[PDB]
RNA sequence: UGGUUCUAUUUUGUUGGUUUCUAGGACCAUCGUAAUGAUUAAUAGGGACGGUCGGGGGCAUCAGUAUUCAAUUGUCAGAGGUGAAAUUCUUGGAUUUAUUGAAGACUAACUACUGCGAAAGCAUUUGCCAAGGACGUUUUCAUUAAUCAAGAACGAAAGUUAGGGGAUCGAAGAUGAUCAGAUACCGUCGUAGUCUUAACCAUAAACUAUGCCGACUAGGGAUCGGGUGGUGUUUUUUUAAUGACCCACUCGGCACCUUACGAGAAAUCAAAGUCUUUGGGUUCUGGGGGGAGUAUGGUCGCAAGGCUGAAACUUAAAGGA
RNA sequence: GCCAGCAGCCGCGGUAAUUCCAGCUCCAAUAGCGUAUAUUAAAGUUGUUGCAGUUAAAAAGCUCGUAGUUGAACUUUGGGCCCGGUUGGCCGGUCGGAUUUCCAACGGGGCCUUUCCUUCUGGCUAACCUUGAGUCCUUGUGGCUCUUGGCGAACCAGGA
């Protein structure tokens, strides 16, 4: 006689005692307050527009040393101030201050990647022309 | 035991086993036709009194009640039934 | 209490038989049960079984074979529609062939393969294998 | 297993099977009727009647010997009592306890037990609602028990 | 079969209104028609009964005994205390002894792989008070039951509120010791509290860190509670009677051993088994580590505090065997 | 020579650096490559199908409960006759498909065995229990032309 009511008329007490439970399970937490719209940068999104400030330097977390390349942004929305991260080379160079940049996630949700600490985004485009190209030289910049 | 007739076992195994399992339940207590010596009378008493009953009227005493079975006095034939 | 009957005795019958008891005794006797066994028996799963009355709700001996593999009571007693049993067999019968799921209609405190030849269905109490 | 403690008692009677007669007893059915109805006004309670009937005269249960069940009979004769007898010992216990709680407000065990007991009663009083044997509404009232018996 | 009651197509011009003709409603009695009509009674439940069982509860009595203290009673140097010490008591003759007393505190050994309770938790004795489990049951009612957001009892101790109690221990406070320091460990005293009445709080490693219902798998030998049987062991009294006992059996426990056919990260597990051959019933919970069960609001409390419960930021490990 | 610098993460670099700067050399995509962001699969790390909750992060302190959710079985089974579809064999019957006997599978309508088919007024009959006549041909339950008593659910259409 495990812990649940079982007979026939035990609809009522079931549609409640899952709907309570669900709570805790983290996911169903995000989706009811859902956080996504109020908290976090993109709100209910995937991508966005921003414009750079400084070119900050963030060393490592440690089993590592690794002085990586990050940029503060200004979005073109809530305004948060965010940092974000660059790929490939130096990549830095090609992000010349107060330029237009196109930001996206980091495929991890929330969370925070690899050897970087409070950091949660990547730089996809600039000006809107790739980075991918303004490192495999299929275009160049204005 | 891999097996057994539990229908009818021994008579043994019942006498000892508890009133309420001999299968079909049946009492142990039973009644007991008493000549106090004076009169011939015959009062139908029960093995477990709870009451002492008086004998018929002679005002006599008979059988005290205890845990289970009366203790009956000295005189009493106490033929069972 | 004892809140339900059929159950109680059944469980002891899958706890006699496991150990190799050749049989059983079970207390509260019903019609329900008498009928239940009378199905089981027809299908080759027990024998004889020697009601005993005592003017009471009564005791029933069930002589063994050592075939029984397993006869759980299901148990709200759900409802069921004809074409639905086709979900049950394969969620609690090893095969199909075989080994009867078992249910309660109107005739009938009678399995499903006989149910086809009748075309009837209601509520599903126990099941054998 | 007694509804109030940690206790799984077993002990009743192992009415015997025979429906009819004791046979060894050969006196009459009318005979014990008379006897009960003899007893009642005097000052009875059906519970006791049997005890007294059993220990002294032929009987074995009224039940064999007649086709009724004591009470039924008193009720025909009008001796049922205003109360269903088992109740009239519980309420009693109430008065008899509450009183004791009030000589010694510094007693808990007793307190609890009282409640417990208020409850035996409400439940048993809800039943002798239901089945037409307490004029509807009856409710039990703590304080009204002492001119209900003395 | 009346009656009753509604009508309102149809013809004695017809248009409308009495109201008689025929036809459809519907009903309470009524002679008649019927195998006249009510599922088992789940090894699901609830109940009654019967012997019972139990350190389950409360209210009262009852006894042990130590400790402390004081009297009485004696003798006469240190006693205490320790790893080793010193503070401490010592003609105001302690420490010891004798016996009686007083007080509040607890319930030794028995006492265990044992008892019962929903858990917390419960052991001197007896009397009321009502409760309850397990069996036994040719009693009963007949699907009433399983788990449960909401809601509502209980909840170790600590702690609080006001009275009572204030032996013993004994945070706090004071101390003497040790120690580079020692606000700690060691020693002696010590309010508060421990105890109880009445009211709060609701937390715990509240621990099997294992939700309950069920149903099925594989062997054992113990034990508590019942019950059944054996011209069973003693009791001896004359034979029985019971009773203890032995054994046989069982149902319900509280566990244990042994396997591993299974499961697992493993350690190990008769359940953590019947799960990629993936599904019997349902309630809670978690989704990297911290930040932090904090800040906030909202709420229960007199307060201590509880329940609710973020985010920014930071980080490549933290962890299990 | 732990400084420049690279490195999404593990990490190189503190005097011979397979990672930095650069030469040659090779590898991958290639008129197209990279780069950052968001989303997807990867994700059985949101899960109903498919998770985990003995100690990894998780079984509420324990019980009662109004909803919610599940809920033993039992109320025509069997047999009897039909008749036909269209897959599959056995003839291809023939200048690569047409169908019959032989004949397996398999559905499906009848009807009958005590057998509701809401059921009455017509019209409706559509079928044979009919049979007024009979016989092409294998010495006949193989083949369908015809009105008369009598089939109602092949169905119109008003109601109860």
Look up tokens 């009727």; give the residue.
Answer: D33
Strands A70-71 and A100-103: unpaired
- Please check whether strand F approaches the CB of A25 to within 7 Å: yes
Q: What SS3 string covers B18-75?
A: CCCCCCCCCCCCCCCCCCCCCCCCCCCCCCCCCCCCCCCCCCCCCCCCCCCCCCCCCC
| Chain B residues touching C59 at Cβ < 8 A | 23
What DSSP assignment string belongs to chain A?
--SS-------HHHHHHHH------TT-----------SSSSS------EE-----B----TT-----BEE------------EE-------SS--SS-EEEE----------TT-------EEEE-------TTT-S----
Q: Are strands A84-85 and A100-103 parallel, antiparallel or unpaired?
A: unpaired
In the DSSP assignment, the letter for residue B78 is: -
d(CA A47, CA C112): 59
Q: How is chain C split into domains, by residue range?
A: 1-68, 69-129
**Contact yes or no for C55/D17 (Cβ under 8 A):** yes
Return the closest nucleotide (C1') to the Cα of D96: E129
Q: Which residues is C71 bridged to in the sheet? A: none
Positive or negative CA dihedral for A102, A104, A110, A116?
negative
Evaluate the CA torsion angle D67, C31, C49, C77 in order and state its sign: negative
Domain boundaries, chain D: 26-80, 81-150
Residues 41-80 of D with CB under 8 A from B: 51-52, 54-58
Using the CB atoms, write b or e for D56-95: b if 16+ within 10 Å: bbbbbebebbbeeebbebbeeeebbbebbbebeeebeebb
Give the residue from D113, D90, B3 showing the smallest Cα distance to C66.
Answer: B3
Rounded to whole angstroms, the maximal C-alpha distance in chain A is 74
**What is the DSSP annotation of chain D?**
--TTSS-------------S--SS----SGGG--HHHHH---S--HHHHHHHHH-----------SSS-------------SS-TTGGG--TT---HHHHHT--------HHHH-------HHHHH---TTTSS-TT--------STTT-
Residues of C in contact with B7 (CB under 8 A): 50, 52, 61
Q: Which residue has the tokens 């043994």?
A: B12
Per the entry, the structure determination technique was cryo-EM
A52 touches strand F (CB under 7 A): no
Q: Please report the sign of the dihedral spanned by the C-alpha atoms of residue D13, residue D18, residue D24, residue D28.
A: positive
The Cα–Cα gap between D64 and D55 comes to 17
Q: Is there a contact between B7 and C59 (Cβ–Cβ < 8 Å)?
A: no
Q: Which of C20, C25, C54 sits opposite B6 (nearest CB)?
A: C25
The whole-angstrom separation of Cα A118 and Cα A103 is: 17
- Listed as ranges, the nucleotides of chain E within 7 A of a protein C-beta are 39-54, 56-60, 116-118, 121, 129-150, 196-198, 211-220, 225-232, 241-243, 245-252, 279-289, 309-317
Residue of D nearest to C55 (CA): D17
| Polymer length in residues for chain C | 129
Residue D38 contacts by C-beta under 8 Å, 6 or more apart in sequence?
Answer: none
Measured between beta carbons, which residues in chain A are less than 8 angstroms from residue C77?
Answer: 8
Whether C22 contacts chain B with CB within 8 A: yes
Nearest CB partner across the interface for C52, out of B2, B3, B23:
B23
Cα gap C119→B37, rounded to integer Å: 80
Task: Write the DSSP assignment of chain C as a string of letters.
Answer: ---------GGG-----TTT------S----TT--HHHHHHH-----------------------TT-----------------GGGTTT---S---------B----B---HHHHHHT----------
What gap in Å lies between CA A77 and CA A41, rounded to an integer? 9
Identify the burial level of A91 via C-beta atoms within 10 angstroms of its C-beta, where 0-12 means exposed, 13-18 middle and 19 or more buried. middle
DSSP secondary-structure letter at B16? T
Q: Which resolution in angstroms does this entry have?
A: 3.7
SS3 B81: coil
The size of the A-C interface in CB pairs under 8 A is: 6
The number of folded domains in chain B is 1
Specify the residue for token string 């600039």. A126
Which subunits have 3 or more CB–CB pairs within 8 Å of chain D? Answer: B, C
- Among protein residues, the one whose C-alpha sits closest to the C1' atom of E241 is B69
User: Domain range for residue B18?
Assistant: 1-81
């Amino acid at each position: 006689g495990k812990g649940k009511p079982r007979g026939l008329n035990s609809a009522r007490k079931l549609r409640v005692h899952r709907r309570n439970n669900r709570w805790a399970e983290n996911n169903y937490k995000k989706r009811l307050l859902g956080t996504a719209f109020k908290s976090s940068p993109f709100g209910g999104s995937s991508h966005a527009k921003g414009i750079v400030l400084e070119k900050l330097g963030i060393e490592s977390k440690q089993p590592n040393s690794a002085i990586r390349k990050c940029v503060r942004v200004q979005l073109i929305k809530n305004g948060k101030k965010v940092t974000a991260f660059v790929p490939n080379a130096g990549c830095l160079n090609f992000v010349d201050e107060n330029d237009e940049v196109l930001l996206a996630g980091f495929g991890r949700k929330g969370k925070a990647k690899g050897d970087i600490p409070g950091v949660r985004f990547k730089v996809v485009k600039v000006s809107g022309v790739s980075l991918l190209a303004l490192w495999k030289e299929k275009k160049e910049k204005p | 035991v891999l097996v057994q007739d539990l229908l009818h076992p021994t008579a043994a195994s019942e006498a000892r086993k508890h009133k309420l399992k001999t299968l079909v339940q049946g009492p142990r207590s039973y009644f007991l036709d008493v000549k106090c010596p004076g009169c011939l009378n015959i009062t139908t008493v029960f093995s477990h009194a709870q009451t002492a009953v008086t004998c018929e009227s002679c005002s006599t005493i008979l059988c005290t009640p205890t845990g289970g079975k009366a203790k009956l006095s000295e005189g009493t034939s106490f033929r069972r039934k | 209490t004892r809140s339900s009957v059929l159950a109680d005795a059944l469980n002891a019958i899958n706890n006699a038989e496991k150990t190799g008891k050749r049989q059983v005794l079970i207390r509260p006797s019903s019609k329900v049960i008498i009928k239940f066994l009378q199905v089981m028996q027809k299908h080759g799963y027990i024998g004889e079984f020697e009601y005993i009355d005592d003017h009471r709700s009564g005791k029933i001996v069930v002589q063994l074979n050592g075939r029984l593999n397993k006869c759980g009571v299901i148990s709200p007693r759900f409802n069921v529609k004809i074409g639905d049993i086709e979900k049950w067999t394969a969620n609690l019968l090893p095969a199909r062939q075989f080994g009867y799921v078992i249910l309660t209609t109107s005739a009938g405190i009678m399995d499903h393969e006989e149910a086809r030849r009748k075309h009837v269905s209601g509520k599903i109490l126990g099941f054998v294998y | 297993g007694r509804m109030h403690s940690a206790g799984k008692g077993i002990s009743s009677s192992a009415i015997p099977y025979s429906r009819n007669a004791p046979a060894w007893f050969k006196l009459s059915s009318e005979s014990v009727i008379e006897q009960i109805v003899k007893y009642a006004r005097k000052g009875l309670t059906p519970s006791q009647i049997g005890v007294l009937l059993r220990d002294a005269h032929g009987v074995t249960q009224a039940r064999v010997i007649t086709g009724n069940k004591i009470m039924r009979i008193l009720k025909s004769n009008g001796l049922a009592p205003e109360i269903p007898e088992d109740l009239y010992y519980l309420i009693k216990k109430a008065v008899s306890v509450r009183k004791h709680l009030e000589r010694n407000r510094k007693d808990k065990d007793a307190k609890f037990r009282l409640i417990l007991i208020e409850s035996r009663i409400h439940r048993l009083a809800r039943y002798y609602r239901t089945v037409a044997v307490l004029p509807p509404n009856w409710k039990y009232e703590s304080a009204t028990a002492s001119a209900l018996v003395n």
